[PDB]
RNA sequence: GAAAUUGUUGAAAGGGAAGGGCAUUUGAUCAGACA
RNA sequence: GGAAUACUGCCAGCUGGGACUGAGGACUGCGACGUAAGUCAAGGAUGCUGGCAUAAUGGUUAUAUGCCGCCCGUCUUGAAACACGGACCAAGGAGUCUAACGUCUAUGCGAGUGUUUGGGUGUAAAACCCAUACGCGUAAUGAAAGUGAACGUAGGUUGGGGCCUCGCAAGAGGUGCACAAUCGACCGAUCCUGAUGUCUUCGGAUGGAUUUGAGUAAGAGCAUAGCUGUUGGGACCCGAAAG
RNA sequence: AAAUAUGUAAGAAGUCCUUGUUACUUAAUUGAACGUGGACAUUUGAAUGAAGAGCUUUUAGUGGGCCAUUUUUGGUAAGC
RNA sequence: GCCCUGAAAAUGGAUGGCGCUCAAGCGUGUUACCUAUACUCUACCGUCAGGGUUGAUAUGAUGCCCUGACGAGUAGGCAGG
């Protein structure tokens, strides 16, 4: 709101905050971005290095659909199971009757191995999966599934 | 709330210090010293008045 | 509770005010032996022909005479770390050589001399307030003197003058105790026409030995 | 136009003394450092490598590594309004022992075996250092020693 | 119109009103710089060492 | 122009956009305009879904 | 004249009261602004510093550390104390059955806590049963882990994250950040 | 039916400006307790 | 030879005159004088008496007297200036709103968060209700192909609030979150090493390197609101010679 | 070869005794670095002081100066 | 040493003025006395800091109360109105 503003503590004071040497003028400087290699330099190699210049190669119209492949650690990978399904496999573990998730129903395309998971069987379809990852699984007594 | 001087006011000039009524009975204030008879010696007085 | 707990605190206080009784009796032989016995060992030393040289002073007590416009900044530093941040402020200081240096350097901005005993009596009992919990408290009884230097074996504001004139094994707590004795200007005048030259020279800073006991009684 | 290079000023600081030009005494090379010991710097003339910039001629800092012919030394430099860490690698000819501590590990030494000695007698064994005292009284005789009287004298050219 | 060129007047006392700052002292000082041959031997020392307590 | 530590800005307003603005005010009266007119194609065309 | 060696009147610069006007959290206030009077407690004291901080000076707990905590020889059976809110954790599969105090519990987190035979009550209730903080553990979240402080003192040969709104390969990785542009930081 | 500005009446001061601050004399005028 | 006095210093020695002040508002403290009961100058004034009760005191106002007082605003090292604006009065008259953001703070929920593009509904631009997506966050690192975060109680050492045990206390021991310094481990890049196997050129196990990253190491974010700051906009208000 | 200014030190992150690790180093358990365990408390290592110390984020104005003592350059000198 | 010569500028003119001659001048010494928004003590206002007090049946725990210290200010910042 307006009454909160400094504006109405500056109300008889002259200057208004700007100072009387140096005054409030409109644009000393510059307008945007002007100067960044003379006279504002330094705010630009500070707080702004790898600004000026080209590193990469050019990529004629992109499409990040090409690009979409969401990832999923296995320490988020019992999440996927309800949770009012969770605990009845857990104290379950056993063959002929393992979990099967769905990776990619769930909106992930492939599978990292971070944290630890149950000493549990369970079934993992997937896209794409790590070295590690399916490790992880199999140690534990599980397969995964490539899916397309 | 109001501080108060001794040595002025005897009151509390006895709350603090119990001995100054026995330092004012017994005039310690006015204590006769012991009379002595040394004289110095020969030298201190020639060289007092030397030139 | 109406006369049990009560009647066992005043007994306390007459035992308390028991040890405070001798301990002054003791003190008064004490300062009167001292004196005497110096006065003696001049006379033997001039009736055997020889001098006797008095023993140096140890104590000396410091007045600021000056302004806080226009100072150096190492004599600034200097009169703070003696706790004289304004004019007319006094503080006793003990006399070694990492403080005579300290003297020298603030000799255009102080008087300073060699206080008696009836310098310190005065200033203690009229002027003498206590650092508490960093908040200057009066000294009107004992009991706040014992609760905050007891420790060291002072419970009593004669045996605060004593750690002071006799500069004991706890001087420097005794000492910084004391909050910094706030002084007016003197009944009768400085006794100079400009104050701002040295003692030697007519003026009124440096150091003039015993004659600061008159100034000082004067600012008292 | 002005000049700032990085032996400007230093006609004769890297001076050597006098009569003590050529080649640098052995024992300069035998002398051995480790890392936390206390070196002062002072450049010598004669050997041009390994050499400490102008400022830190005269500075004291702690060694922090050791090489084959150099030492590194850790400095602190006031920039501005606050010291800033400075690391130095110096050859061995620039640089010397401290013995600004080697006569305070002397006195720790000594505190220990004040300490100890008067465990089994006296409390209060007093290991702290104290400044110099006002002197105590004293009795000055005159046999053999009557004071000569002075006087100033009268003003006299002799030239 | 010429101006003023070079001062340090002022200076000094804007340094001490909150600077002149005494670097503070770490234990464990940072091994930066230090001999790389002296380096890769006491990893190896620190590490051995480790197995002898924890055993 | 450029000052503190601040990220690069890449505001587009170099244009006379001020005459290009569409506020929509009419929101909420276009929500009944929809449903009147769905309530009166239903009515007129037919039993039709 | 007074040569002053600090600056006059000037505040302590902590928090003395909550900047929040929740009428509950000065109940809260209230009562253990009387307890850290009148109970010489250092816990308590610290419990009402605690109610003043901020936001981002109160950071979340989560269930997996207060477990974590609670596997210290000798604390499985103390009351863990948190003045904040208390997250829940899926990472973890196990969780004991203690007593966690706390302004606030998620929904989850008090599922979690609950369906392994424990507890959550509010401080108040804690006072009362603990009085003096008898067997209790304080818990506090990470500070620096916030994604502004990645920000904070940027600069060369920093190492920090530059204030960049969009990340990729023509965003701030050519001169200045490598040898072959010029220099490299 | 305000101000600048103006007339009449009444009071006051005025030896090359007028106006102001602190204090009191003089003139005019006025509230508060009569418990 | 025996005193006095001067000068200087001390007294918890006595005593006369004058001025300013009276803060506090049951009791509580420390003392003093007393055989006691009590009293007191002892943690801040009471006692007695007179005049008047109204313009008498006092307030306001005009005037007189003593002393003092240069014209404001502005730029400036420096303004009463022989520097600039201002003859007078009334009304009007200058940091605003918007898009995208930094820090901080409050609120809701929280590994999630955001109902309002739209649909339902309605006492009809309000309020109330809702699906699917999408945005940001939950993974980084390389130019890219690509690969992708536990040797271990998610590590060791030092300092750590609080808690636990002993103890009258002081202290000692145990556990130590946040945070600080440091040594390691893990993931990507770079430079090396090149096993079992081979569409004989593929494959890249294992072990390293004063190299490098806006990383991991029991998540903190998303949304709304406010002060301050930033950029584009007429952009605090008025002003060019031009094109 | 001064005076004035100027670097460092005055302890627990210290000292001492015993003996563990390593791919470094040594003719060599020689040394180096980092540790296990033991012994010495705050007259625990000079003085004085310390409106407590340490730390972080963010942003305003300013970036024409001038004068005095002392040191000092150009200039006959200057309110240069 | 003091005094004098050396010693000439333009409106009328300034030890601040009057005036002052064993000074009311110059050098030096000893006292008394005068007065700053400075120093000392007290009251009141505000600010900051450290503390006391939730017990109902009487009202503000952002309340009430105890203790100590402090107070200049352009540009500028923040707070209460
Ligand atoms: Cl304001
Ligand atoms: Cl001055
Ligand atoms: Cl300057
Ligand atoms: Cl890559
Ligand atoms: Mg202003
Ligand atoms: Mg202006
Ligand atoms: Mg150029
Ligand atoms: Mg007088
Ligand atoms: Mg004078
Ligand atoms: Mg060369
Ligand atoms: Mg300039
Ligand atoms: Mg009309
Ligand atoms: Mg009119
Ligand atoms: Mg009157
Ligand atoms: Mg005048
Ligand atoms: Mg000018
Ligand atoms: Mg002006
Ligand atoms: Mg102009
Ligand atoms: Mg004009
Ligand atoms: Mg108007
Ligand atoms: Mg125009
Ligand atoms: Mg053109
Ligand atoms: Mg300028
Ligand atoms: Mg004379
Ligand atoms: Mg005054
Ligand atoms: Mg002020």
């Given at each position: 709101?307006?009454?909160?503003?400094?504006?109405?503590?500056?109300?008889?004071?002259?200057?208004?905050?700007?100072?009387?040497?140096?005054?409030?003028?409109?644009?000393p400087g510059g307008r945007g971005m002007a100067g960044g290699q003379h006279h504002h330099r330094i705010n630009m190699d500070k707080y702004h290095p790898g600004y000026f210049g080209?590193?990469?190669?050019?990529?004629?119209?992109?499409?990040?659909?090409?690009?979409?492949?969401?990832?999923?650690?296995?320490?988020?990978?019992?999440?996927?199971?309800?949770?009012?399904?969770?605990?009845?496999?857990?104290?379950?573990?056993?063959?002929?009757?393992?979990?099967?998730?769905?990776?990619?129903?769930?909106?992930?395309?492939?599978?990292?191995?971070?944290?630890?998971?149950?000493?549990?069987?369970?079934?993992?379809?997937?896209?794409?999966?790590?070295?590690?990852?399916?490790?992880?699984?199999?140690?534990?007594?599980?397969?995964?599934?490539?899916?397309? | 709330?109001?501080?108060?001087?001794?040595?002025?006011?005897?009151?509390?000039?006895?709350?603090?210090?119990?001995?100054?009524?026995?330092?004012?009975?017994?005039?310690?204030?006015?204590?006769?010293?012991?009379?002595?008879?040394?004289?110095?010696?020969?030298?201190?007085?020639?060289?007092?008045?030397?030139? | 509770?109406?006369?049990?707990?009560?009647?066992?605190?005043?007994?306390?206080?007459?035992?308390?005010?028991?040890?405070?009784?001798?301990?002054?009796?003791?003190?008064?032989?004490?300062?009167?032996?001292?004196?005497?016995?110096?006065?003696?060992?001049?006379?033997?030393?001039?009736?055997?022909?020889?001098?006797?040289?008095?023993?140096?002073?140890?104590?000396?007590?410091?007045?600021?005479?000056?302004?806080?416009?226009?100072?150096?900044?190492?004599?600034?530093?200097?009169?703070?770390?003696?706790?004289?941040?304004?004019?007319?402020?006094?503080?006793?200081?003990?006399?070694?050589?990492?403080?005579?240096?300290?003297?020298?350097?603030?000799?255009?901005?102080?008087?300073?001399?060699?206080?008696?005993?009836?310098?310190?009596?005065?200033?203690?009992?009229?002027?003498?307030?206590?650092?508490?919990?960093?908040?200057?408290?009066?000294?009107?009884?004992?009991?706040?003197?014992?609760?905050?230097?007891?420790?060291?074996?002072?419970?009593?504001?004669?045996?605060?003058?004593?750690?002071?004139?006799?500069?004991?094994?706890?001087?420097?707590?005794?000492?910084?105790?004391?909050?910094?004795?706030?002084?007016?200007?003197?009944?009768?005048?400085?006794?100079?026409?400009?104050?701002?030259?040295?003692?030697?020279?007519?003026?009124?800073?440096?150091?003039?030995?015993?004659?600061?006991?008159?100034?000082?009684?004067?600012?008292? | 136009?002005?000049?700032?290079?990085?032996?400007?000023?230093?006609?004769?600081?890297?001076?050597?003394?006098?009569?003590?030009?050529?080649?640098?005494?052995?024992?300069?090379?035998?002398?051995?450092?480790?890392?936390?010991?206390?070196?002062?710097?002072?450049?010598?003339?004669?050997?041009?490598?390994?050499?400490?910039?102008?400022?830190?001629?005269?500075?004291?800092?702690?060694?922090?590594?050791?090489?084959?012919?150099?030492?590194?030394?850790?400095?602190?430099?006031?920039?501005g309004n606050r010291?800033?860490?400075?690391?130095?690698?110096?050859?061995?000819?620039?640089?010397?022992?401290?013995?600004?501590?080697?006569?305070?590990?002397?006195?720790?030494?000594?505190?220990?075996?004040?300490?100890?000695?008067?465990?089994?007698?006296?409390?209060?064994?007093?290991?702290?250092?104290?400044?110099?005292?006002?002197?105590?009284?004293?009795?000055?005789?005159?046999?053999?020693?009557?004071?000569?009287?002075?006087?100033?004298?009268?003003?006299?050219?002799?030239? | 119109?010429?101006?003023?060129?070079?001062?340090?007047?002022?200076?000094?006392?804007?340094?001490?009103?909150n600077?002149?700052?005494?670097?503070?002292?770490?234990?464990?000082?940072?091994?930066?710089?230090?001999?790389?041959?002296?380096?890769?031997?006491?990893?190896?020392?620190?590490?051995?060492?480790?197995?002898?307590?924890?055993? | 122009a450029i000052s503190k530590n601040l990220p690069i800005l890449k505001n587009?307003?170099?244009?006379?956009?001020?005459?290009?603005?569409?506020?929509?005010?009419?929101?909420?009266?276009?929500?009944?305009?929809?449903?009147?007119?769905?309530?009166?194609?239903?009515?007129?065309?037919?039993?039709?879904? | 004249?007074?040569?002053?060696?600090?600056?006059?009147?000037?505040?302590?610069?902590?928090?003395?009261?909550?900047?929040?006007?929740?009428?509950?959290?000065?109940?809260?206030?209230?009562?253990?602004?009387?307890?850290?009077?009148?109970?010489?407690?250092?816990?308590?004291?610290?419990?009402?510093?605690?109610?003043?901080?901020?936001?981002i000076?109160?950071?979340?707990?989560?269930?997996?550390?207060?477990?974590?905590?609670?596997?210290?020889?000798?604390?499985?059976?103390?009351?863990?104390?948190?003045?904040?809110?208390?997250?829940?954790?899926?990472?973890?599969?196990?969780?004991?059955?203690?007593?966690?105090?706390?302004?606030?519990?998620?929904?989850?987190?008090?599922?979690?806590?609950?369906?392994?035979?424990?507890?959550?009550?509010?401080?108040?209730?804690?006072?009362?049963?603990?009085?003096?903080?008898?067997?209790?553990?304080?818990?506090?979240?990470?500070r620096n882990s916030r994604e502004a402080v990645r920000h904070f003192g940027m600069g060369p040969h920093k190492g920090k994250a530059p204030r960049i709104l969009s990340t990729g390969?023509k965003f701030e990785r050519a001169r200045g950040r490598?040898?072959?542009?010029g220099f490299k930081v």
């Amino acid at each position: 709101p307006s009454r909160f503003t400094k504006t109405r503590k500056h109300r008889g004071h002259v200057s208004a905050g700007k100072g009387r040497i140096g005054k409030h003028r409109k644009h000393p400087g510059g307008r945007g971005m002007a100067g960044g290699q003379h006279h504002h330099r330094i705010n630009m190699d500070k707080y702004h290095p790898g600004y000026f210049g080209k590193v990469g190669m050019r990529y004629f119209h992109k499409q990040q659909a090409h690009f979409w492949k969401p990832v999923l650690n296995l320490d988020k990978l019992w999440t996927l199971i309800p949770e009012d399904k969770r605990d009845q496999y857990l104290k379950s573990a056993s063959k002929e009757t393992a979990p099967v998730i769905d990776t990619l129903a769930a909106g992930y395309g492939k599978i990292l191995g971070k944290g630890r998971i149950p000493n549990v069987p369970v079934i993992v379809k997937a896209r794409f999966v790590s070295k590690l990852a399916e490790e992880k699984i199999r140690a534990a007594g599980g397969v995964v599934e490539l899916i397309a | 709330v109001l501080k108060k001087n001794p040595l002025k006011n005897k009151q509390v000039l006895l709350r603090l210090n119990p001995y100054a009524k026995v330092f004012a009975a017994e005039k310690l204030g006015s204590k006769k010293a012991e009379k002595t008879g040394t004289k110095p010696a020969a030298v201190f007085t020639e060289t007092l008045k030397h030139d | 509770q109406v006369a049990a707990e009560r009647a066992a605190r005043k007994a306390a206080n007459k035992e308390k005010r028991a040890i405070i009784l001798e301990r002054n009796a003791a003190y008064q032989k004490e300062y009167e032996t001292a004196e005497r016995n110096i006065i003696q060992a001049k006379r033997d030393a001039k009736a055997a022909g020889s001098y006797y040289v008095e023993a140096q002073h140890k104590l000396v007590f410091v007045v600021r005479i000056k302004g806080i416009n226009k100072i150096p900044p190492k004599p600034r530093k200097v009169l703070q770390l003696l706790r004289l941040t304004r004019i007319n402020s006094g503080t006793f200081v003990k006399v070694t050589k990492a403080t005579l240096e300290l003297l020298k350097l603030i000799e255009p901005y102080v008087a300073y001399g060699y206080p008696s005993y009836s310098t310190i009596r005065q200033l203690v009992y009229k002027r003498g307030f206590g650092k508490i919990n960093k908040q200057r408290v009066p000294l009107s009884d004992n009991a706040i003197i014992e609760a905050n230097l007891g420790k060291y074996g002072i419970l009593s504001i004669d045996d605060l003058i004593h750690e002071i004139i006799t500069v004991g094994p706890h001087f420097k707590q005794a000492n910084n105790f004391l909050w910094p004795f706030k002084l007016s200007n003197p009944s009768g005048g400085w006794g100079v026409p400009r104050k701002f030259k040295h003692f030697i020279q007519g003026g009124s800073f440096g150091n003039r030995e015993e004659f600061i006991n008159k100034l000082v009684k004067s600012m008292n | 136009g002005k000049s700032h290079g990085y032996r400007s000023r230093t006609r004769y600081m890297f001076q050597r003394d006098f009569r003590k030009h050529g080649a640098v005494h052995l024992s300069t090379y035998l002398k051995v450092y480790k890392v936390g010991d206390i070196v002062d710097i002072k450049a010598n003339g004669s050997i041009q490598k390994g050499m400490p910039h102008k400022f830190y001629q005269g500075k004291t800092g702690v060694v922090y590594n050791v090489t084959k012919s150099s030492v590194g030394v850790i400095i602190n430099k006031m920039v501005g309004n606050r010291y800033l860490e400075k690391r130095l690698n110096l050859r061995v000819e620039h640089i010397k022992h401290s013995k600004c501590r080697q006569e305070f590990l002397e006195r720790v030494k000594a505190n220990a075996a004040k300490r100890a000695e008067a465990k089994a007698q006296g409390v209060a064994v007093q290991l702290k250092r104290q400044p110099a005292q006002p002197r105590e009284s004293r009795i000055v005789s005159t046999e053999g020693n009557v004071p000569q009287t002075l006087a100033p004298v009268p003003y006299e050219t002799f030239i | 119109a010429k101006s003023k060129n070079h001062t340090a007047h002022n200076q000094t006392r804007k340094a001490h009103r909150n600077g002149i700052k005494k670097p503070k002292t770490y234990k464990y000082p940072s091994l930066k710089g230090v001999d790389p041959k002296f380096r890769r031997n006491h990893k190896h020392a620190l590490h051995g060492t480790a197995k002898a307590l924890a055993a | 122009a450029i000052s503190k530590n601040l990220p690069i800005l890449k505001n587009h307003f170099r244009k006379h956009w001020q005459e290009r603005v569409k506020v929509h005010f009419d929101q909420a009266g276009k929500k009944v305009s929809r449903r009147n007119a769905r309530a009166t194609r239903a009515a007129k065309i037919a039993p039709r879904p | 004249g007074i040569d002053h060696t600090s600056k006059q009147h000037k505040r302590s610069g902590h928090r003395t009261a909550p900047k929040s006007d929740n009428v509950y959290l000065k109940l809260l206030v209230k009562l253990y602004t009387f307890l850290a009077r009148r109970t010489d407690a250092p816990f308590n004291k610290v419990v009402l510093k605690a109610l003043f901080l901020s936001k981002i000076n109160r950071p979340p707990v989560s269930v997996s550390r207060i477990a974590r905590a609670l596997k210290q020889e000798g604390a499985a059976n103390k009351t863990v104390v948190v003045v904040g809110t208390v997250t829940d954790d899926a990472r973890i599969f196990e969780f004991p059955k203690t007593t966690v105090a706390a302004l606030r519990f998620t929904a989850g987190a008090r599922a979690k806590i609950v369906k392994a035979g424990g507890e959550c009550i509010t401080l108040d209730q804690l006072a009362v049963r603990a009085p003096k903080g008898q067997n209790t553990l304080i818990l506090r979240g990470p500070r620096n882990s916030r994604e502004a402080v990645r920000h904070f003192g940027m600069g060369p040969h920093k190492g920090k994250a530059p204030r960049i709104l969009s990340t990729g390969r023509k965003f701030e990785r050519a001169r200045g950040r490598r040898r072959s542009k010029g220099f490299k930081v």
